[PDB]
Amino acid sequence: IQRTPKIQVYSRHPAQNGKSNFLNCYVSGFHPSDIEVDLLKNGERIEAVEHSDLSFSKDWSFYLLYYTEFTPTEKDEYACRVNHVTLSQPKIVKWDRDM
Amino acid sequence: GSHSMRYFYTSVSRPGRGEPRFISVGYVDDTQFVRFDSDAASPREEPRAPWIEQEGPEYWDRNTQIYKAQAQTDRESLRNLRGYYNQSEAGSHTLQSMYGCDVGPDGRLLRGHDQYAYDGKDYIALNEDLRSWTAADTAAQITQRKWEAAREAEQRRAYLEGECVEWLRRYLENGKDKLERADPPKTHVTHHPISDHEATLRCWALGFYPAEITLTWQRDGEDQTQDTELVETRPAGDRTFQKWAAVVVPSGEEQRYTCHVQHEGLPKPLTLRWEP
Amino acid sequence: TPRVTGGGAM
Ligand SMILES: [Cl-]
Ligand SMILES: [Cl-]
Ligand SMILES: [Cl-]
Ligand SMILES: [Cl-]
Ligand code: NA
Ligand SMILES: [Zn+2]
């Protein structure tokens, strides 16, 4: 009937403090397609985050990549926050450089 | 090697919020090259890969007219579908379409696909023979009877064996420097203690294309299927993909574990260990 | 290039 999203938050390249990179949030395996994704910097919404065109896998579940240019630092914390019909509360996944 | 072309359409009704949005995306292998969105300010087929930009105005014009006609047909199909399932006019519904062709190294047709899903469930699909349909339920049997009466499969087969193969062959030639290039994974193993007596070994694969990859951990040469955390292959945003596989190991036993990587970009498969 | 169907709908 409905499928909840899988969420992965990660960088385009291994993170190096002071070097420009891209922060990604990949949402996949969900149905229906309506979904809301925010990227957060120190708990605040990052403005002008871009995303890929709506597509889906062979099992018909949808996937999207949300992304923003960023320069990681030792102090700054990042996360992805996802809302979907299958979720009673927004789901937050923290960026962990090791994952 | 083998290549594919696929188009993925999504039509979603939204009662009280206008007519159903129709979006289409086109791929060659794991490379998206076109999009069309009925919600765009001026809906038109747009390029999404460098090698398709050379197509003339007649390409974008003809294709835009195809998607606009398809959006109208999908809206008619959504109305019919709602009736076949005795559904209210109040709820939203989704109709997905996925079709295309697979060709070998010589450009010859290996397999065609032309299928649909309603509300995320398989609905109807053209069989491998490209001449008959498989309907999932009594509602899709209505679609099948209509398509059999209209000899609809014949037009589908003609595209899959004809235009689909000929355009895929053209796109592969035009985008050869990327589409015919396999980028191997860049690998490393990380080690993170969990407690005094266990640590996680994580095997990384980065920067590879196409997405297809096999990442496994072995303990004394035996696959660790049930004990491996394996994340879904994910896009990096630069055309490449990433993946990792992790295992929890007893402290001091790290050298008994080997990570095995298979990818088309690799001369031979990789065998990696944690290098302290 | 995308496909054209019969247009008779589902
Ligand atoms: Cl939502
Ligand atoms: Cl209903
Ligand atoms: Cl190119
Ligand atoms: Cl995952
Ligand atoms: Na995961
Ligand atoms: Zn039709």
Q: CB of B249 within 8 A of CB of B198? A: yes
C-alpha B240, offset from chain centre: 14
Do residue B18 and residue B116 come from a single domain?
yes
CB burial readout A4-28, b (16+ within 10 A) else e: ebebbbbbbbebeeeeeebbbbbbb
Question: Chain B contacts of A56, Cβ < 8 Å?
Answer: 8, 10, 96, 98
Do residue B81 and residue B113 come from a single domain?
yes
Q: CB of B189 within 8 A of CB of B202? A: yes
B114 touches chain A (CB under 8 A): no
**Please, how many CA atoms are within 13 Å of residue B44, restricted to the half-sphere of its CB?**
9
Facing residue for A32 by CB, picked from B94, B232, B234: B94
Q: CB of B259 within 8 A of CB of B214? A: no
Give the end of a domain, one of B181, B205, B220: B181
Residue where the block lists tokens 């008994």: B256
Do residue B116 and residue B236 come from a single domain?
no
In angstroms, this model's resolution equals: 1.6
C-alpha to C-alpha distance for B206 and B212, rounded to whole angstroms? 12
| DSSP label of C7 | S
Experimental technique for the deposited model: X-ray
Q: How far is CA A33 from CA A56, B128, B251, in A?
A: 9, 28, 44
Give the end of a domain, one of B136, B154, B181: B181
Cβ contact B238–A34 (<8 Å): no
E-only strand ranges, A1-73:
6-11, 21-30, 36-41, 44-45, 50-51, 55-56, 62-70
Interface test with A, best of B93, B234, B240 (most A CBs within 10 A): B234
Give chain B's domain count.
Answer: 2
Residue where the block lists tokens 């060709």: B103
C-alpha A57, offset from chain centre: 18
Do residue B167 and residue B228 come from a single domain?
no
Give the end of a domain, one of B181, B200, B231: B181
Q: Who contacts B221 (Cβ-Cβ below 8 Å, separation ≥6)?
A: B258
Q: Which residue of B has its CA nearest to A34?
A: B12
Do residue B149 and residue B191 come from a single domain?
no
What's at B39, amino acid-wise? D
Q: How far is CA A79 from CA A14, A26, A48, A91, B91, in A?
A: 16, 12, 16, 10, 33
Cβ contact C9–B116 (<8 Å): no
Instruction: Output the DSSP codes for chain B.
Output: --EEEEEEEEEE--TTS-SPEEEEEEEETTEEEEEEETTSSS---EE-SGGGTTS-HHHHHHHHHHHHHHHHHHHHHHHHHHHHTT--TTS--EEEEEEEEEE-TTS-EEEEEEEEEETTEEEEEE-TTSS-EEESSHHHHHHHHHHHHTTHHHHHHHHHHTHHHHHHHHHHHHTHHHHT-PBPPEEEEEEEEEETTEEEEEEEEEEEBSS--EEEEEETTEE-GGG-EEPPPEE-SSS-EEEEEEEEEETT-GGGEEEEEE-TT-SS-EEE----
Do residue B173 and residue B199 come from a single domain?
no
Q: Which residue of C has its CA nearest to B159?
A: C3
Cis, bond preceding A32 (omega within 30 deg of 0): yes
- In the numeric block, which tokens belong to residue B269? 């498969």
Do residue B157 and residue B230 come from a single domain?
no
Do residue B1 and residue B98 come from a single domain?
yes
CATH number at residue B18: 3.30.500.10
Do residue B26 and residue B138 come from a single domain?
yes
Do residue B77 and residue B169 come from a single domain?
yes
Using CA of residue B204, residue B210, residue B211, residue B212, what is the dihedral sign? Answer: negative
Q: Which domain holds residue B168?
A: 1-181
CA of A81 to the centre of ligand 2 (A): 31
Cβ contact A56–B242 (<8 Å): no
Do residue B216 and residue B168 come from a single domain?
no
Which subunits sit against C, judged by 3+ Cβ pairs under 8 A?
Answer: B
CA of B143 to the centre of ligand 4 (A): 36
- In the numeric block, which tokens belong to residue B14? 């939204």
CA of B245 to the centre of ligand 4 (A): 11
